[PDB]
Write an enzyme that holds these catalytic residues in place. Structure first.
Site, PDB file in Angstrom:
ATOM      1  N   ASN A 147       1.718   1.805  17.563  1.00 40.78           N
ATOM      2  CA  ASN A 147       0.495   1.829  16.801  1.00 40.78           C
ATOM      3  C   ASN A 147      -0.607   1.302  17.697  1.00 40.78           C
ATOM      4  OD1 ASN A 147       1.414   2.477  14.080  1.00 40.78           O
ATOM      5  ND2 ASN A 147       2.127   0.228  13.870  1.00 40.78           N
ATOM      6  N   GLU A 171     -12.469   3.564  10.733  1.00 39.01           N
ATOM      7  CA  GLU A 171     -11.305   4.484  11.016  1.00 39.01           C
ATOM      8  C   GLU A 171     -10.978   4.899   9.643  1.00 39.01           C
ATOM      9  OE1 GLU A 171      -8.786   1.657  12.383  1.00 39.01           O
ATOM     10  OE2 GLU A 171      -9.715   1.537  14.487  1.00 39.01           O
ATOM     11  N   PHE A 227       8.299   4.379  25.160  1.00 40.08           N
ATOM     12  CA  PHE A 227       7.000   4.999  25.396  1.00 40.08           C
ATOM     13  C   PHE A 227       5.929   3.965  25.953  1.00 40.08           C
ATOM     14  CE2 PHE A 227       8.594   7.580  21.768  1.00 40.08           C
ATOM     15  CZ  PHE A 227       8.850   8.784  22.573  1.00 40.08           C
ATOM     16  N   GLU A 258      -9.879   0.144   7.211  1.00 39.78           N
ATOM     17  CA  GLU A 258     -10.592  -0.720   8.354  1.00 39.78           C
ATOM     18  C   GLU A 258     -11.563  -0.334   9.041  1.00 39.78           C
ATOM     19  OE1 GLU A 258      -7.714  -1.674  11.315  1.00 39.78           O
ATOM     20  OE2 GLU A 258      -8.973  -3.479  12.235  1.00 39.78           O
ATOM     21  N   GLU A 301       0.706  -1.280   0.011  1.00 40.67           N
ATOM     22  CA  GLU A 301      -0.123   0.070   0.140  1.00 40.67           C
ATOM     23  C   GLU A 301       0.916   1.252   0.087  1.00 40.67           C
ATOM     24  OE1 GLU A 301      -3.252  -0.949  -0.415  1.00 40.67           O
ATOM     25  OE2 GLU A 301      -3.956   1.326  -0.618  1.00 40.67           O
TER      26      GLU A 301
HETATM   27  N1  LIG Z   1      -2.083   3.135   5.166  1.00 40.25           N
HETATM   28  C1  LIG Z   1      -1.373   3.759   6.105  1.00 40.25           C
HETATM   29  N2  LIG Z   1      -0.492   4.816   5.995  1.00 40.25           N
HETATM   30  C2  LIG Z   1      -0.010   5.382   7.175  1.00 40.25           C
HETATM   31  N3  LIG Z   1      -0.161   4.935   8.509  1.00 40.25           N
HETATM   32  C3  LIG Z   1      -0.898   3.778   8.548  1.00 40.25           C
HETATM   33  C4  LIG Z   1      -1.383   3.250   7.532  1.00 40.25           C
HETATM   34  N4  LIG Z   1      -2.243   2.137   7.978  1.00 40.25           N
HETATM   35  C5  LIG Z   1      -1.805   2.045   9.159  1.00 40.25           C
HETATM   36  N5  LIG Z   1      -1.073   3.175   9.609  1.00 40.25           N
HETATM   37  C6  LIG Z   1      -0.686   3.371  10.905  1.00 40.25           C
HETATM   38  O1  LIG Z   1      -0.876   2.198  11.873  1.00 40.25           O
HETATM   39  C7  LIG Z   1      -1.776   2.556  12.883  1.00 40.25           C
HETATM   40  C8  LIG Z   1      -2.627   1.281  12.949  1.00 40.25           C
HETATM   41  O2  LIG Z   1      -3.343   0.890  11.803  1.00 40.25           O
HETATM   42  P1  LIG Z   1      -4.283  -0.357  11.803  1.00 40.25           P
HETATM   43  O3  LIG Z   1      -5.532   0.195  12.058  1.00 40.25           O
HETATM   44  O4  LIG Z   1      -4.715  -0.608  10.172  1.00 40.25           O
HETATM   45  O5  LIG Z   1      -3.730  -1.442  12.337  1.00 40.25           O
HETATM   46  P2  LIG Z   1      -4.069  -2.780  13.124  1.00 40.25           P
HETATM   47  O6  LIG Z   1      -3.109  -3.324  13.854  1.00 40.25           O
HETATM   48  O7  LIG Z   1      -5.025  -3.498  12.147  1.00 40.25           O
HETATM   49  O8  LIG Z   1      -5.215  -2.136  14.074  1.00 40.25           O
HETATM   50  P3  LIG Z   1      -6.421  -2.683  14.949  1.00 40.25           P
HETATM   51  O9  LIG Z   1      -5.815  -2.676  16.581  1.00 40.25           O
HETATM   52  O10 LIG Z   1      -7.606  -1.479  14.981  1.00 40.25           O
HETATM   53  O11 LIG Z   1      -6.966  -3.830  14.756  1.00 40.25           O
HETATM   54  C9  LIG Z   1      -2.545   3.495  12.380  1.00 40.25           C
HETATM   55  O12 LIG Z   1      -3.034   4.218  13.626  1.00 40.25           O
HETATM   56  C10 LIG Z   1      -1.512   4.615  11.808  1.00 40.25           C
HETATM   57  O13 LIG Z   1      -0.615   5.214  12.533  1.00 40.25           O
HETATM   58 MG   LIG Z   2      -6.877   0.082  13.967  1.00 36.93          MG
END
Ligand SMILES: Nc1ncnc2c1ncn2[C@@H]1O[C@H](COP(=O)(O)OP(=O)(O)OP(=O)(O)O)[C@@H](O)[C@H]1O
Ligand SMILES: [Mg+2]
Ligand SMILES: *C(=O)CCCC[C@@H]1SC[C@@H]2NC(=O)N[C@@H]21
Lengths: 230, 673, 222
Positions: B241, B281, B354, B294, B206
C-alpha cells in the site's frame, strides 16, 4: 644542582660527565655546544668527542634526572650535530641513554627531534658503528634510537626500555605488571631479544664498553683492526 | 516569480531530505531568505549547505530532532522566522504545533487547525463528505466495538469485507477479510495492533472494491474562499500500500469524468473550508464509478508531476496564499500541458517482497540532468549516508514529454543513465514496470505488482536478441580491457613486442548456460560471432567512465560495469537489471573444465538478516524446532516493521539475536538444523 | 581516468567523534585510478593496508592505517608487513603514498615480550631509507612517536598534507595548527582534492635524485 647529584649518587648512578670521564681516555674529552640553552646551559645533554686507546670516537650523554625538565629542541639539535660530525669524519658514535627526569607531558613537539635522530641513525647505518648503552629508564619514541643502532647494552636493575608505562598497561589491558618485569634488563636480555648484554653497574658497563669498542673498526672503509699478537 | 511583490523575508523549513531542498529552491526563486533545521547526523546535508544559516534541532532520532518541538520554537525565536513550512510527514498534521504557532506571531503555511481536526480520522470525515454530497464507499457508519456487530455489518454490506484502523495511516492497520470468521478474527487482531501501534482502539468496517484505480485530485484553497482543482493523477502501481510509480494525466479517465472529479473535490474542500494545498484520493472501479477515500491536508509526495502538466509551482502558490494574497489563476486558466511520469527511486532491494530497505554510504552518485525532459528531486549527494532513522527514499525522477510514448522513452533513458554506487536500489523494478506491456497499454490496477509478478520480482527476462547483444557487449568490453592492458610506455632498454592475435575465442557463462564467442577488433569496431549470430559493436571504449554507450547493430545501448575481476567475473548493468557473467578464453575454459567444485557447503539450513535495524523481539529460543511459514523475529527500521519466516523445518542449535538488540544486514540471526 | 577528477564523497567520510571508526579502503578506492586496488596480505594484520594501484597510469604503492581493526594501532605483525612492502617498493623505483590515522602502538606485556621495539624500528628504517618519491596524507590522527613512524616530514618526506579533520599531538594540540605553523605539513587540503594534488606531486617528483654516504649495506634491525 648539588642536591640532584647527591640524589643520583644515592641510587648507585653517576652523572653524565662522570660517565664520559670514565668512558674516555684521561684528558681527551672535547665538549661541543657548551653554551646552548633551552634557562640553563647544557640542555640536559653533554655532547663531544674523545679518544679510546688513541682512537677517535664521538659521545653524548643524558642527565635528565639531575638537569633539565624534558626533551627540548636543542637536545635533538646537539645530538644531530654530533652525529653529523661523526659521519663527516668517519668515527663511531657511542650514546649513553638516560631519560629518567624527562617529562612526557612537557614535550613541545619533540617528535620532530626524534624523527631527525632516527633519520640520522638510518643514514649512518652501515657507514660508522653505533653503540647504545641504556643507563636509566627510557620511554616513548626514545626507545627506537637504540633499536636502530648496531649494538645495545643495559645496566642491571637501573635501566628500562618500554613503549608505554605500566600504568597505561593496567589501564588498557587490565594487567598488574611492575616496571622491572615490563622493561627490565633481564627481560630485554633473556626473552625479548632487544638488548645484547647486561652489566652489574655503571663502572663495569663502561669498562666492558671500552673493551668491546677496542674490537670494532672506525668505519666501513677501514679494514678489520689488527693488534699485536703473542 | 515577481520579487517586487512583498512576501515573508525569512522562512523556516522544518523538514529534511528532498522536500527541504525543493522548498529552499522555491524560496530562493522568490527572493526569500531561508533557514533550515537539521539533526546532528545531517550536519552536512544538501539543504543545510544550500540554505543560509542552520540550527541543530536535536540528536539523530526523529522523535528527538524533528519532533522535539521546543527545539523548533527556540530555533524560530532565535532566527525570528515569520513562517514555517512542514513539507509532508512529521509535523505536517500536528494540531498542537498549529496552536503553539498561533500562540506566537509565526504563521503556519498549511491548512488551519479546523481542517486537520476534521480530516484527522476516517469515519466522521466520511460523514462530513457524505453531507457534502460526495460519492463514497458503501458501508456502515459508526464505531464498531464487537465482533458480532462486525459480522452483521459484513452480512448487510456484502461478502468482501475490509477492516481499517482509523487515524494512523501509512499502509498500516489495514486488512481484507473474506469470511465471517475471518471478519471477527481480523477485527480482534486489528484491535490488538491498534492498541499496540496507534492506541485509538477504534476500528472501521467497509466494503472492498475489486480491481480499483487510485486517482488523486490536487486542490488549492485560500482564506478568500476560492477553491481550485489541478487535474488528476494516477498512482495505481504500489506495493505494501505504498506508491512507487505515479502518472499525472490518467489514461483511464475521460474529460467529463475528470470534470466531475474536480467539481466534487472542490465542493468537498469548500465544505471543509480548506485554505491551503491538499490532495483528495478516490477509488475508481472498472465501470468508471468513483468513491471517496481520505484526503491529505499537506503537500503530496507526488506533487511535482502535476506541475509538469500545469506549469505552476505548488510551493510558491502555498506561500502566496499563506501571505494573504488571493489566487491569480482561475478554473479556465489551467490546462494539460503535455504528459508526465514519475518514479520514486528508493534505497531498497526489489528482489525481496517488492522492496527491501538497506543502509550504506553512497560511493558514487550521478544524475541524468543533461538528458532532455528530466527533472530530479533529490536530497542526497556523493558521500551521503543512509541511516536506520529516516525514509529509505533516494530521489524522485520525473520525465515529461508530448505524449505517453515519448515520456516513457525518456524515463527509460534516464533510468539507464542514473549512477548509484554504494547501496542497492530498485531501478530495475521501475524500468520493468515502465516497459511492461500492460503498463504501456494502460490496463493496470492497485494489485499490478501482485498479479504480474506472483512469486516476486525476478529481473528482466531478456530475449534472444537482447541476450546476444549483452554477450557481444560483454565480450567486446573484455577484449578492450585486454588490449588496453598491453599499452606501455617506451622502455628504450627492453622494447615491448605487442602480440598480434587476430581472433579472440572466448567462453561466456551466463546464468547457467555457456556460449562460444569469436571477437575481432578493427580500430574501434568489434565484430562478434555468437553461436552463428554476427554483430558489430562500436563505441569510444572509455574504460574509466561509469557509463558506457555502445552502438550494437545501430541500436544505442547504455551499460555500466559495476564490477570486474581478473578471474573473469563481471557485473554489467544492462537495460536496468544487473547480470553476472564469467568470461574466459577457450583454452582457459578447457583447463577450468578439470577444476573441482570444492567442498562449499551449500546445504542452507541457516537464516540471515536482510534487515539492518533494531530487532524488537525474538520468537525463538535455543532448542526450538522451526516450521514453514513461522516468523523468527520482527526487525524495525525505515519507519516500518516486518518479520521473516524460515520456510523450512529445523531445530534451533543456537540463538544469536536477542530482543532489543541491533542486527545489521546479512548478519546471522539464528542457526537452525 | 582524468588526473584532475574530484572525489566529493571523501569530504564527510571521517566521523567527527574520535571513538568512531571508518574504512580506509574506501578512501584508497576513491583516490586511485578506476578504483582498482591490488591489496597484499588482505587477511593478515588487518590494522594496516598495503597494496599496489595506479595514479595517472603510473604504478604506485599504498600504505595506510585501518581504524576499523584495533583502532589503527601499530603492532609487530603490521610493522613487519608494512616494512617489507615499503622496502620492496623503494628497491624498484615505485612511488609511495601513505594515509596516516594512528593513535600509537598497541600496549601490553605480550607486545613488549615479543619485541615491539625491534619491529617498530623496522618500520621506521623502511620509511626512512626510501629514496623513491613519497606523498603522505594525514586523515584524522597522528599521536606520539607513531606519527614519526609513518613517513613524517623529517624522514625526507617530500610532500605532506593534512585534512581539516586531522589532529597531531604528542599525547592523548587538538588541531593541525601546530604542525602547520611548525612546517610539518605543506598544506591543509580539502578531502575532495586529494587525487589532483597527489598526481601533480608525483609528476613533479618523478625526477627526484638524492645522494647518500657509500656503504656495502646497512644494518636493518631484523
Ligand atoms: N476501500 C478500499 N477498497 C479497496 N482497496 C482499498 C480501500 N481502502 C484502501 N485500499 C487500498 O489501500 C491503499 C491505501 O489506502 P489508504 O489511503 O486508505 O491508506 P493509508 O495508510 O491511510 O494511506 P496514507 O499513506 O495516504 O495515509 C490504497 O491505495 C488501496 O490499494
Ligand atoms: Mg493514501
Ligand atoms: C520518517 O522518515 C518519515 C518520512 C516522511 C514521512 C513519510 S513520507 C510521506 C508520508 N506521508 C506521512 O505522513 N509519512 C510518510
Amino acid at each position: 644542582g648539588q642536591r640532584r647529584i647527591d640524589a643520583q649518587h644515592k641510587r648507585g648512578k653517576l652523572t653524565a660527565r662522570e660517565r664520559i670521564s670514565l668512558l674516555l681516555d684521561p684528558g681527551s674529552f672535547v665538549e661541543s655546544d657548551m653554551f646552548v640553552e633551552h634557562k640553563f646551559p647544557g640542555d640536559s645533554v653533554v655532547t663531544g668527542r674523545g679518544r679510546i686507546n688513541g682512537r677517535l670516537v664521538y659521545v653524548f650523554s643524558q642527565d635528565f634526572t639531575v638537569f633539565g625538565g624534558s626533551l627540548s629542541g636543542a637536545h635533538a639539535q646537539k645530538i644531530c650535530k654530533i652525529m653529523d660530525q661523526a659521519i663527516t669524519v668517519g668515527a663511531p658514535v657511542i650514546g649513553l641513554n638516560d631519560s629518567g627526569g624527562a617529562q612526557i607531558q612537557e614535550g613541545v613537539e619533540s617528535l620532530a627531534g626524534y624523527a631527525d635522530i632516527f633519520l640520522r641513525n638510518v643514514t649512518a647505518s652501515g657507514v660508522i658503528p653505533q653503540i647504545s648503552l641504556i643507563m636509566g629508564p627510557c620511554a616513548g619514541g626514545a626507545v627506537y634510537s637504540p633499536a636502530l643502532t648496531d649494538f645495545t647494552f643495559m645496566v642491571k636493575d637501573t635501566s628500562y626500555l618500554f613503549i608505554t608505562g605500566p600504568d597505561v598497561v593496567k589501564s588498557v589491558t587490565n594487567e598488574d605488571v611492575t616496571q622491572e618485569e615490563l622493561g627490565g634488563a633481564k627481560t630485554h636480555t633473556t626473552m625479548s631479544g632487544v638488548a645484547h648484554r647486561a652489566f652489574e653497574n655503571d663502572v663495569d658497563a663502561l669498562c666492558n664498553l671500552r673493551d668491546f669498542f677496542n674490537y670494532l673498526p672506525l668505519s666501513s672503509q677501514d679494514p678489520a683492526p689488527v693488534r699485536e699478537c703473542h | 516569480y515577481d520579487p517586487n511583490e512583498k512576501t515573508f523575508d525569512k522562512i523556516l523549513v522544518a523538514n529534511r531530505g528532498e522536500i527541504a531542498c525543493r522548498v529552499i529552491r522555491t524560496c530562493k526563486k522568490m527572493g526569500i531568505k531561508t533557514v533550515a533545521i537539521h539533526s546532528d547526523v545531517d550536519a552536512s546535508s544538501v539543504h543545510v549547505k544550500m540554505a543560509d544559516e542552520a540550527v541543530c534541532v536535536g540528536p539523530a532520532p526523529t522523535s528527538k530532532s524533528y519532533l522535539n518541538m521546543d527545539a523548533i520554537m527556540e530555533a524560530i525565536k532565535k532566527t525570528r522566522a515569520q513562517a514555517v513550512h512542514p513539507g509532508y510527514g512529521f509535523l505536517s498534521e500536528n494540531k498542537e504545533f498549529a496552536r503553539c504557532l498561533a500562540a506566537e506571531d509565526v504563521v503556519f503555511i498549511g491548512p488551519d487547525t479546523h481542517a486537520i481536526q476534521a480530516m484527522g480520522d476516517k469515519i466522521e470525515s466520511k460523514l462530513l463528505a457524505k453531507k457534502a454530497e460526495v460519492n463514497t464507499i458503501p458501508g456502515f457508519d459508526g464505531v464498531v466495538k464487537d465482533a458480532e456487530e462486525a459480522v452483521r455489518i459484513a452480512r448487510e454490506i456484502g461478502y468482501p469485507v475490509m477492516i481499517k484502523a482509523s487515524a494512523g495511516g501509512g499502509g498500516k492497520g489495514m486488512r481484507i477479510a473474506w469470511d465471517d470468521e475471518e471478519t471477527r478474527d481480523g477485527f480482534r487482531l486489528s484491535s490488538q495492533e491498534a492498541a499496540s501501534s496507534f492506541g485509538d482502539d477504534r476500528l472501521l468496517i467497509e466494503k472492498f472494491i475489486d480491481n480499483p484505480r487510485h486517482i488523486e485530485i490536487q486542490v488549492l484553497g485560500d482564506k478568500h474562499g476560492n477553491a481550485l482543482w489541478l487535474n488528476e493523477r494516477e498512482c495505481s502501481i504500489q506495493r505494501r500500500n505504498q506508491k512507487v510509480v505515479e502518472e499525472a494525466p490518467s489514461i483511464f479517465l475521460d474529460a467529463e469524468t475528470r470534470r466531475a472529479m474536480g467539481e466534487q473535490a472542490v465542493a468537498l474542500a469548500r465544505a471543509v473550508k480548506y485554505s491551503s494545498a491538499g490532495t483528495v484520493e478516490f477509488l475508481v472501479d472498472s465501470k468508471k464509478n468513483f468513491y471517496f477515500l481520505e484526503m491529505n491536508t499537506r503537500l503530496q509526495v507526488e506533487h511535482p508531476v502535476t506541475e509538469c502538466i500545469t506549469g505552476l509551482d505548488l510551493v510558491q502558490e502555498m506561500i502566496r496564499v499563506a501571505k494573504g494574497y488571493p489566487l491569480r489563476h482561475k478554473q479556465a486558466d489551467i490546462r494539460i500541458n503535455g504528459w508526465a511520469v514519475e518514479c520514486r527511486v528508493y534505497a531498497e532491494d526489489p528482489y525481496k517482497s517488492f522492496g527491501l530497505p538497506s543502509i550504506g554510504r553512497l560511493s558514487q552518485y550521478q544524475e541524468p540532468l543533461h538528458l532532455p525532459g528530466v527533472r530530479v528531486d533529490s536530497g542526497i549527494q556523493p558521500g551521503s549516508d543512509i541511516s536506520i532513522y529516516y525514509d529509505p527514499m533516494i530521489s524522485k525522477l520525473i520525465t515529461y514529454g508530448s505524449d505517453r510514448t515519448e515520456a516513457l522513452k525518456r524515463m527509460a533513458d534516464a533510468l539507464d543513465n542514473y549512477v548509484i554506487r554504494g547501496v542497492t536500489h530498485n531501478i530495475a523494478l521501475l524500468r520493468e514496470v515502465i516497459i511492461n506491456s500492460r503498463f504501456v497499454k494502460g490496463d493496470i490496477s492497485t494489485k499490478f505488482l501482485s498479479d504480474v509478478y506472483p512469486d516476486g520480482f525476478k529481473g528482466h527476462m531478456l530475449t534472444k536478441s537482447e541476450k546476444n547483444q549483452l554477450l557481444a557487449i560483454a565480450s567486446s568490453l573484455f577484449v578492450a580491457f585486454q588490449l588496453r592492458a598491453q599499452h606501455f610506455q617506451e622502455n628504450s632498454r627492453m622494447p615491448v613486442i605487442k602480440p598480434d592475435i587476430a581472433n579472440w575465442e572466448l567462453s561466456v557463462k551466463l546464468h547457467d548456460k555457456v556460449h562460444t564467442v569469436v571477437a575481432s577488433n578493427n580500430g574501434s569496431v568489434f565484430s562478434v560471432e555468437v553461436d552463428g549470430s554476427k554483430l558489430n559493436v562500436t563505441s569510444t571504449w572509455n574504460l574509466a567512465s561509469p557509463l558506457l554507450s555502445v552502438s550494437v547493430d545501430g541500436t544505442q545501448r547504455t551499460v555500466q560495469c559495476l564490477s570486474r575481476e581478473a578471474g573473469g567475473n563481471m557485473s554489467i548493468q544492462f537495460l536496468g537489471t544487473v547480470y553476472k557473467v564469467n568470461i574466459l578464453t577457450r583454452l582457459a575454459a578447457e583447463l577450468n573444465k578439470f577444476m573441482l567444485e570444492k567442498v562449499t557447503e551449500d546445504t542452507s539450513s541457516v537464516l540471515r538478516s536482510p534487515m539492518p535495524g533494531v530487532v524488537v523481539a525474538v520468537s525463538v529460543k535455543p532448542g526450538d524446532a522451526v516450521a514453514e511459514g513461522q516468523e523468527i523475529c520482527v526487525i524495525e527500521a525505515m519507519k516500518m516493521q516486518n518479520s521473516m519466516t524460515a520456510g523450512k523445518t529445523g531445530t534451533v542449535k543456537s540463538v544469536h539475536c536477542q530482543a532489543g538488540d541491533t542486527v545489521g544486514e546479512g548478519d546471522l540471526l539464528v542457526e537452525l538444523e | 581516468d582524468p588526473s584532475d577528477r574530484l572525489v566529493p564523497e571523501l569530504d564527510t567520510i571521517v566521523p567527527l567523534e574520535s571513538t568512531k571508526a571508518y574504512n580506509m579502503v574506501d578512501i584508497i578506492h576513491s583516490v586511485v585510478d578506476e578504483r582498482e586496488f591490488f591489496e597484499i596480505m588482505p587477511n593478515y594484520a588487518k590494522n594496516i593496508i598495503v597494496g599496489f594501484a595506479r595514479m595517472n597510469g603510473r604504478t604506485v604503492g599504498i600504505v595506510g592505517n585501518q581504524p576499523k581493526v584495533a583502532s589503527g594501532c601499530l603492532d609487530i605483525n603490521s610493522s613487519v608487513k608494512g616494512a617489507r612492502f615499503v622496502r620492496f617498493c623503494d628497491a624498484f623505483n615505485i612511488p609511495l603514498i601513505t594515509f596516516v590515522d594512528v593513535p600509537g602502538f598497541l600496549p601490553g606485556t605480550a607486545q613488549e615480550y615479543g619485541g615491539i621495539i625491534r619491529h617498530g624500528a623496522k618500520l621506521l628504517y623502511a620509511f626512512a631509507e626510501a629514496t623513491v618519491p613519497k606523498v603522505t596524507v594525514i586523515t584524522r590522527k597522528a599521536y606520539g612517536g607513531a606519527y614519526d613512524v609513518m613517513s613524517s616530514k623529517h624522514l625526507c618526506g617530500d610532500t605532506n598534507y593534512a585534512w581539516p579533520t586531522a589532529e597531531i599531538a604528542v599525547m592523548g594540540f587538538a588541531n593541525p595548527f601546530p604542525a602547520a605553523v611548525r612546517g610539518f605539513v605543506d598544506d591543509i587540503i580539502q578531502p575532495s582534492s586529494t587525487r589532483a594534488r597527489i598526481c601533480c606531486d608525483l609528476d613533479v617528483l618523478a625526477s627526484k635524485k638524492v645522494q647518500r654516504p657509500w656503504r656495502k649495506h646497512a644494518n636493518i634491525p631484523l
